[PDB]
């Protein structure tokens, strides 16, 4: 009867949390937003078509500036692109071609790679030996890796298939902290702009806020009803939007962690693969399985335009840190850049 | 423009050419997706530390097959099964001698029922509408003496036939063939083999050659 008593206590305390966050919402964001001017149509024509991949592209990531971005695909190539001149700087070979995540270090010195091989790979882009050489082979995850955003040059956070997130050290290869508490399979990760906290999404339709220095879930919320596979922070760090396989995008804040606004339309019944913000936070950019991309007003929940032009389902899109342009990758071995 | 920019463009063109000549051999490098139930003879089929996809490279009559054993991937299969659109075939190794015992440690579900459910899941995927299945029914040597004593009534209370080897093999054949919900664009290959039996590389060669005949009819614009 102890297990039943613990389950009843957990249920009543979760009901208390739900009642507290229900009474905490004195007003909704719609009735505050309904008296401001709307954003016009975002007629964002394509500018750069980074041809060169020979297989399906799953991940991309920008740098601290524009003009440099990395991409991963099942051809075993981790291509770093020169964005303005359409050039490619490096074509990094991969030991395992099963890749679905890649990231670019803020120092510009390292790149991440991982996937169904359950091993994170760190490559050294700047070396006296003239090549791209692997530096640290991060092992210790029993599931497939899905997101490998860089904290800094020495700390790396990995979202993996073992229903746990891990924070590693490059020089030792060991997990400093392990983030446990996700019941479902985990395929999302995004770090805060001030580099203090991070969020992660899983199959249980729950996005959990974690702390890096001590390693436990500070806050969570379940508003989705399907698998969550896209997460990113608002540029101020006090909100984050959620992308799922539910044909809806949902906005949660870091202060109350409730349903601020949903971004769903009747004409779209396809899942979301990637979600990113502009640097002002007014425009929310969401990938889709409808073979295109849609931009969303993060305040009015209105469609500000469609980034159509991809021959297949898009899988990765990122916005530059100066808000310059967005590079949407897709399954058609293309990487279009939109301004 | 600048000599820096011109040399950068030349370097980009050179690595484009290198990437093209490295990816042109990926069409020749044909790929296979091997999966099935646990301890179903999958370990003895591959003879003819990442803790993930086991990569085995073998060739037969200059075709360069690749097998992707996903037996070490215990995560949710729905979120990584879409990485195998371009695979040419699926190898499904299941054991005929695993019909009467359910787990050999507990009593909740038969291994053959779980194998049937896994085959129905992997055959009716929306990613494998046109991906042929090379079904393997191995360890027939252990199935010879395991059928004279224990009939099919333990596994199926609907058989009502003859307790013999050939009719049992044909009935398992009929069960596995009816799991295909669309026989027009999908063709399932089943081979009878043992743990110490040859003529499996010939069977997979015949399967892959038939699928690439279908592909060469497809790109020419006929099929």
């Amino acid at each position: 009867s102890e297990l039943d008593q613990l389950r009843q206590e957990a249920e009543q305390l979760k009901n208390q949390i739900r009642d507290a966050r229900k009474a905490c919402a004195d007003a909704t964001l719609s009735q505050i937003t309904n008296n401001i001017d709307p954003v016009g149509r975002i007629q964002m024509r394509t500018r750069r078509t980074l041809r060169g991949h020979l297989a399906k592209i799953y991940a991309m990531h920008w740098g601290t500036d524009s003009r440099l971005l990395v991409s991963a695909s099942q051809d075993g190539k981790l291509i770093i692109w020169d964005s303005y001149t359409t050039n490619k700087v490096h074509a990094i070979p991969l030991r395992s071609s099963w890749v679905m995540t890649c990231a670019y270090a803020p120092s510009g010195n390292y790149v991440a790679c991982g996937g169904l091989d359950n091993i994170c790979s760190i490559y050294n882009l700047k070396t006296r030996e003239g090549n791209v050489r692997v530096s640290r082979e991060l092992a210790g995850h029993t599931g497939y890796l899905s997101c490998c955003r860089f904290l800094d040059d020495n700390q790396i956070v990995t979202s993996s298939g073992d229903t746990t997130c891990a924070l590693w050290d490059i020089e030792t290869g060991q997990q400093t902290t392990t983030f446990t508490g996700h019941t479902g399979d985990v395929m999302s990760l995004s770090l805060a702009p001030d580099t203090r906290l991070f969020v992660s999404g899983a199959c249980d339709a729950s996005a959990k806020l974690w702390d890096v220095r001590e390693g436990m879930c500070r806050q969570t919320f379940t508003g989705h009803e399907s698998d969550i596979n896209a997460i990113c922070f608002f540029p101020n760090g006090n909100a984050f939007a959620t992308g799922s396989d539910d044909a809806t995008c949902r906005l949660f804040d870091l202060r109350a962690d409730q349903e601020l606004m949903t971004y769903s339309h009747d004409n779209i019944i396809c899942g979301i693969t990637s979600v990113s913000f502009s640097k002002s936070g007014r425009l929310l950019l969401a990938g889709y399985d409808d073979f295109n991309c849609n931009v969303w007003d993060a305040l009015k929940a209105d469609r500000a335009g469609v980034l159509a032009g991809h021959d297949n389902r898009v899988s990765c899109l990122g916005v530059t840190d100066d808000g310059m342009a967005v590079a949407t990758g897709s399954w058609d071995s293309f990487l279009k850049i939109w301004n | 423009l600048s000599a820096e920019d011109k040399a950068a463009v030349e370097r980009s063109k050179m690595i484009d050419r290198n990437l093209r000549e490295d990816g042109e051999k990926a069409a020749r490098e044909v790929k296979l997706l091997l999966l099935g139930a646990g301890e179903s003879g999958k370990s003895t089929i591959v003879k003819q530390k990442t803790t993930g996809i086991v990569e085995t490279h073998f060739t037969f009559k200059d075709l360069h097959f690749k097998m992707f054993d996903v037996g070490g991937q215990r995560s949710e299969r729905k979120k990584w099964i879409h990485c195998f659109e371009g695979v040419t075939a699926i190898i499904f190794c299941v054991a005929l001698s695993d019909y009467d015992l359910v787990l050999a440690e507990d009593e909740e579900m038969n291994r053959m029922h779980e194998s049937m459910k896994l085959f129905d899941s992997i055959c009716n995927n929306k990613w494998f509408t046109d991906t042929s299945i090379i079904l393997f029914l191995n360890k027939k040597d252990l199935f010879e003496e395991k059928i004279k004593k224990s009939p099919l009534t333990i596994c199926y209370p609907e058989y009502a036939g003859s307790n013999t080897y050939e009719e049992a093999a044909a009935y398992i054949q009929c069960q596995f063939e009816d799991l295909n919900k669309r026989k027009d664009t999908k063709e399932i290959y089943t081979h009878f083999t043992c743990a110490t039996d040859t003529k499996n590389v010939q069977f997979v060669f015949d399967a892959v050659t038939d699928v690439i005949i279908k592909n060469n009819l497809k790109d020419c614009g006929l099929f």
Partner: single-chain antibody
Amino acid sequence: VQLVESGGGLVQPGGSRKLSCSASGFAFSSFGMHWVRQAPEKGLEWVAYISSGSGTIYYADTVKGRFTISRDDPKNTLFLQMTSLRSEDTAMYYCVRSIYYYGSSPFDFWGQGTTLTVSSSDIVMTQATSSVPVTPGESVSISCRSSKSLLHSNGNTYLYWFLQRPGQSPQLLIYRMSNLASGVPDRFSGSGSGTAFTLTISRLEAEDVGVYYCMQHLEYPLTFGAGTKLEL
């Protein structure tokens, strides 16, 4: 990462010598190589340039059609065929490696060099000053001029600074303007916009003595400046 020289020596005028350089410790196939001379009493001047994969070959106006540069990527070596040598070809031949992409540092390594003795328009760079007095712990700002603007539409300024210690190869310090090379201590503040460019040392050291050269990489030939020695 070090370059090993071979060949050279005494040759009759009008003859030939198979000048070669054997690379080691780095990926030779991805580096665009060079050859840079240095007369026994004068400064540096660019001779030839072979790109990655031998796809682009350039020479100076004085060696156009007279010298042949070749590379062996599988054999990991670099050659230079010198035809009809004269007394104006008596210099010290250096081998220089470079890769050109975004953020790369060309001219980042120089060989030890080999000697060749023979018996008896272009954007010029001028170093107006030469052999300045200097003291340790002080700050000196040497400058060199150009005959043309060295800033294209891409926005970056193409100035290459080299320090040559006595008895040592030239060492890259400032590969592009306001950019510091790897392994160089963070006290060399290269600057200059438009026509005039300069190098600044915050605190001089004993190992900082030598002769400085500024090189432009905007067109060809990659002609150098004069010498700017340091006298204690």
